[PDB]
Amino acid sequence: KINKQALIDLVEQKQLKAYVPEFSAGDEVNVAIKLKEKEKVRIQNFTGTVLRRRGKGISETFIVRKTTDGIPIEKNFQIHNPNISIELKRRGKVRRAYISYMRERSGKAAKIKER
């Protein structure tokens, strides 16, 4: 019959967040995950900067990295995922919204903040 391709968002409205911080390419943020076990749900704090943001709807994702014991680990996270907590502390100064080059660049990979 009559097609919308817009009701996708309407049915995705059932899972939305009402805070939604800003993230483009340089936000130094620590993210918390409510890891659920049989008892005493743990709260993990994972810090790092964001490389690039991709999204169309509920499918909104961002990147975040840590470096512990010399080993770096990078993880993607969907924004509208429950059991996740985001608390921003630094806004950075970047040139392009899509950057990925920390994968190769060595130590002292930090970036100056947005003055």
Residues that bind RNA (CB under 7 A): 2-6, 24-25, 52-59, 61, 76, 78, 93-101, 105
Q: 18 vs 95, which CB is nearer to another protein?
A: 18
30's contact among another protein, RNA, none, with CB below 5 to 8 A by partner kind, is: none
Q: If binding is defined by CB under 8 A, does position 43 make contact with another protein?
A: no
Find where tokens 């939604």 sit: 20
Taking residue 49's Cβ as centre, other Cβ atoms within 10 Å add up to 21
Residues in the chain: 115
Q: In whole angstroms, how close is the CB of 104 to RNA at the nearest point?
A: 8
Q: In what order do the strands lie in the sheet with 42-49?
A: 42-49, 28-35, 84-90
Residue 26 sits at the vertex; the CA angle it makes with 91 and 110, to the nearest 5 degrees, is 95
Q: Which does 17 bind (CB under 5 to 8 A by kind): RNA, another protein, none?
A: another protein
The answer to whether 74 and 64 are in contact (CB under 8 A) is yes
Name the residues that contact another protein, by CB under 8 A.
Answer: 1, 3-5, 7-8, 10-12, 14-19, 36, 44, 57-59, 68-78, 80-83, 85, 103
